[PDB]
Design a protein around this ligand. Structure first.
Ligand SMILES: [Mg+2]
Ligand SMILES: [Mg+2]
Ligand SMILES: [Zn+2]
Ligand SMILES: [Zn+2]
Ligand SMILES: [Zn+2]
Ligand SMILES: [Zn+2]
Lengths: 449, 449
């Protein structure tokens, strides 16, 4: 029944200076909560991942774009919540590695088995395990993979590739870093080659550059990975106009959208945080990114078309969407770039719920692969790292700190983080769980075996 | 019905290197969750605050004392979870201050009205508003206030004092910083004086030192605050032995335990984090604190006696327990001191749930006032701040970083953080809520007006 509620408005109710004015709740949630619980099987699953979107990343984005008492229409409107752990494993010893990377974590929600950082679709012994996209496809469901990063990147790759090192993008690199994976050595092939092999119905993102390499062995040996895609019946799109034109995407006519050479461009602009930037520099106000060409589709646009095409399959669909640069910008210590991307992920989460709400059998999940560096500190702060002051929507200054790395790249962190869901089987994300339970939650919802 | 479950075992189910081995869930939670939902009124309420206990603080403690795949028998066993916001207000402008202190936040969950940092029980206008402990007492319910910090510190004081500055501990300071509060100027009195006025049934913690001042005005002017307590029917205890002897604590015979001049001592020892400590210094293994005399009671012991005493009142009770030094040690950049205290709080949370489980009408809440500085980073990290390497229970190294302040004290952070509950009306903590909603959830559960 379309009787399961999405959080309507969790914004502050009134005057935050007045008693009860900062409240986000209007009444008791006991009933509404009872109405969100359902162990009926999910027909569809949309999994939204914001790379590096820890609770801290979620708070700074809200504080700035919607103000402290604000509310993310998408990101915050999911009724059921919990916290989950995402530690990885040390390759040699098999003990825990408290801070995972994009590859070991992505692998965990995809296969349900922990692995060492850098691995994609294999356990610590180097044995392959089937991904949820692969199991979806086998049962007859439709499949989609959407991201704002190069399709070869860890997060989207973890669903279609089984390599020993995330560096094995296309043919050349594979030969050198994943020899037992290289096609000419009789391996399954590079990440790019295994993606074309996988043949999901809809694949959208960046990474057009690796597609320029020519394979070394196999049927298409000699031909660039791009000619092969063509040669195998893939529809190729490079912009919004083209994307808007596709009316079908199935096994006979799978869709492949390559919107950028490398990663798709970020939405906002802002300088990079600096030492004492909060006390030596004026407050910043993010502005749109000039280089972002009007033709490059947005995550929400892409999520919209994907869901439109995929929902045709009467059996069902599984889709994974990732706002990839929150993390990348968090690594670069660029508050504006980071917040812009969280806002961008929120627009897509809204499209997800919209469909969810009116269909009634879609399970939607929103979370991140791990926590990151960014911190929200006081304005008078004298930090050892990189800081910047922002003018928020509250019309107040907000200071952000990056202080875990003194190298050119800010580092991930291992704190447990938020996981939120809405729909059939959402109860399984409440409480403390582990990134791997997610794999199991999905599989059970769709009734895969 | 005692049919409402607490989370049994959320530890990894088996071999974490194996498929399904890291899972924390055994089945579907939809039913178990349905059985945790109840809008029946709560007869009692126990509120446990870990000062500065952000998700990061909880992860590190677990990683160390229980290992990555571990599970806090108390802190992690609460079935319903959410994330809540705790921003404060700028005094002048009344706009949000994204990073609150111990006072503004404590005031928020006590009165339900946001305030500026430093304030205890008054809004930005300086108007007093009633605390949840006060409303409890008026309804006839029994009340208790437990903490390991000076009873005059922000967290426990926010429940019984209405001053303009948290610095107004006893008579002297009040006269100079809260003149319009000073007893001699016709004010309600210093924090300490207002505490003895409040007359909760059970009050345990530190801060014996301030009780040595003599009041300036009123009926007991001339007499030290201690003689006054005695003069007003207060039982005074200073250690375990003495504490174990009380068999009654009511309005006629209220219990006041002062177990330390300042803050009670921390449980573990370990050196302080240092610049490149993780790379220039050997891994650390915390050890018990030599100075912690065997006679100073522990948080769990105190929670145990208090609940024992308070549960006599047939009408009900309201209790607040605080593990205060997680924050203090977090400020001091001492990983062992911080982790020892979280474990200590976990023991109390266990004692809380034990009662809850068998009584059936108690609502238990475990959360923090705000997030803090500590981060869990990679072993080879080269950070600008303070780091240290620990040998966890997994027999692996874990590195912790402190890098938001270059002053002698590490700073708070403003990330939304976990809030977990078990019992009647626990549904109101799921999803995104604000620290003030907590004031309203408790009041409605106990049916206060
Ligand atoms: Mg990614
Ligand atoms: Mg405190
Ligand atoms: Zn990542
Ligand atoms: Zn990263
Ligand atoms: Zn605090
Ligand atoms: Zn503090």
């Amino acid at each position: 029944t379309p009787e399961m509620p999405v959080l309507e408005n969790r914004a502050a109710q009134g005057d935050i200076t007045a008693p009860g004015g900062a409240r986000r709740l209007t009444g008791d949630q006991t009933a509404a909560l009872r109405d969100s619980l359902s162990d009926k099987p999910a027909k569809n699953i949309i999994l939204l991942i914001g790379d590096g979107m820890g609770d801290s990343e979620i708070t700074a984005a809200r504080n700035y774009a919607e103000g402290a008492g604000g509310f993310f229409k998408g990101i915050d409107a999911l009724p059921l919540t919990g916290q989950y752990t995402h530690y990885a494993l040390n390759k040699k010893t098999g003990k825990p590695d408290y801070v995972t990377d994009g590859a070991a974590s992505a692998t965990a929600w995809s296969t349900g088995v922990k692995t060492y950082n850098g691995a994609l679709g294999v356990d610590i012994h180097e044995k392959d395990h089937p991904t949820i996209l692969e199991m979806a496809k086998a049962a007859g469901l439709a499949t989609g993979n959407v991201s704002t990063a190069e399709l070869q990147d860890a997060t989207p790759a973890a669903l279609v590739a089984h390599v020993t090192s995330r560096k094995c993008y296309g043919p050349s690199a594979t030969s050198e870093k994943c020899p037992g994976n290289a096609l000419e050595k009789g391996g399954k092939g590079s990440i790019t080659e295994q993606l074309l092999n996988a043949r999901a119905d809809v694949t959208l993102g960046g990474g057009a550059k690796t597609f320029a390499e020519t394979a070394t062995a196999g049927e298409w040996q000699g031909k660039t990975l791009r000619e092969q895609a063509q040669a195998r019946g893939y529809q190729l799109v490079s912009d919004a106009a083209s994307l808007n034109s596709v009316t079908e995407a199935n096994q006979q006519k799978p869709l492949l959208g390559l919107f950028a050479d490398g990663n798709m461009p970020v939405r906002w602009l802002g300088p990079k945080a600096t030492y004492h930037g909060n006390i030596d520099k004026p407050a910043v106000t993010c502005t749109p990114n000039p280089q972002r060409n009007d033709s490059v589709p947005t995550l929400a646009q892409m999520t919209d078309k994907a869901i439109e095409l995929l929902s045709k399959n009467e059996k069902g669909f599984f889709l994974q969407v990732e706002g990839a640069s929150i993390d990348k910008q968090d690594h670069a210590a660029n508050p504006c770039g980071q917040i812009g991307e969280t806002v961008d992920l929120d627009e897509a989460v809204q499209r997800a719920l919209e469909f969810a709400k009116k269909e009634g059998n879609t399970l939607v999940i929103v979370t991140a692969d791990h926590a990151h560096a960014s911190q929200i500190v006081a304005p008078d702060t004298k930090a050892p790292g990189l800081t910047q002051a922002l003018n928020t929507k509250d019309g107040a200054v907000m200071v952000m700190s990056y202080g875990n790395s003194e190298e050119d790249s800010q580092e991930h962190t291992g704190s447990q983080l938020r996981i939120a869901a809405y729909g059939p089987h959402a109860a399984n994300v409440v409480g403390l769980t582990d990134q791997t339970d997610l794999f199991y939650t999905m599989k059970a919802a769709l009734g895969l075996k």
